């Protein structure tokens, strides 16, 4: 599923991401836009053999099991394929673990390079929340 901007913002707000660990909702929408273009089926292979999955491009090196990343962890206790679902519950629940691990949203390279330090509230402008 390819979400609309405000459709995704509402889903993220319902699932508790607005001001989660101090990150206002527009940060999360901005990161999803540049990680996956709001497409829950996005996948991208990394140079080390791991794969990124879903709307927030969560990596199999640490967070989910795909059966093809030897030596990796599964900290969200989920098959990576669950992250490709049209329902974003698994992705949100796993993102909450990631952002709580110490590096905040710097865990997402696109957030650090394209969202950090910008006017992120622009990403939720116009939405009915």
Task: Answer with the entry of Na ion, Cl ion, none that 104 interacts with (C-beta below 5 to 8 A by kind).
Answer: Cl ion
121 belongs to the binding site for Cl ion (CB under 5 A) = yes
Placement of tokens 């901007």 in the chain: 5
- Site residues (CB under 5 A) for Na ion? 60, 65, 69, 72, 74
* Contact between residue 66 and residue 80 where contact means Cβ atoms under 8 Å apart: yes
CA-atom Rg of the chain in angstroms: 14
Q: How far from 15 is each of 42, 47, 68, 91, CA to CA, in Å?
A: 21, 32, 30, 10
- Using the contact rule CB under 5 A, the part of the chain among 3-11, 49-57, 67-75, 88-96 near Cl ion is 67-75
* Active site positions, annotated: 35, 52
Residue 80 or 88: which CB sits closer to Cl ion? 80
| Site for Cl ion, rule CB under 5 A | 24-26, 69, 104, 114, 121
């Amino acid at each position: 599923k390819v979400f609309g901007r405000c459709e995704l913002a509402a889903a993220m707000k319902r699932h508790g991401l607005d001001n989660y660990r101090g990150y206002s909702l527009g940060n999360w929408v901005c990161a999803a836009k540049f990680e996956s273009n709001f497409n829950t089926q996005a996948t991208n292979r990394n140079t080390d053999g791991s794969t990124d999955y879903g709307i927030l491009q969560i990596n199999s090196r640490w967070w989910c099991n795909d059966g093809r990343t030897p030596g990796s962890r599964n900290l969200c206790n989920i098959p990576c394929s669950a992250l490709l679902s049209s329902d974003i519950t698994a992705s949100v629940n796993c993102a909450k673990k990631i952002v709580s691990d110490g590096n905040g949203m710097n865990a997402w390279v696109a957030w650090r390079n394209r969202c950090k330090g910008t006017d992120v509230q622009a990403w939720i402008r116009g939405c009915r929340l």
